[PDB]
Amino acid sequence: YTSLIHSLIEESQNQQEKNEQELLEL
């Protein structure tokens, strides 16, 4: 479970930076 959680959080962290960048670009 620990590895499943870590991979999801890592993906979430990249998605957050992407979403914040895309928001700023609008």
Partner 1 sequence: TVQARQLLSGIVQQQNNLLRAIEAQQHLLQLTVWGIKQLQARIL
Taking CB under 8 A as the criterion, which residues in 7-26 touch partner 1?
Answer: 8-9, 11-13, 15-16, 18-20, 22-23, 25-26
User: Cα–Cα distance between 2 and 24 in angstroms, integer?
Assistant: 33
User: Cα–Cα distance between 13 and 18 in angstroms, integer?
Assistant: 9
* Cβ 11 to partner 1 shortest distance, Å: 5
Q: Which amino acid makes up residue 11?
A: E
Number of residues engaging partner 1 in binding (CB under 8 A): 19
User: Cα–Cα distance between 1 and 19 in angstroms, integer?
Assistant: 26
Judged by the rule CB under 8 A, the positions of this chain that interact with partner 1 are 1-2, 4-6, 8-9, 11-13, 15-16, 18-20, 22-23, 25-26
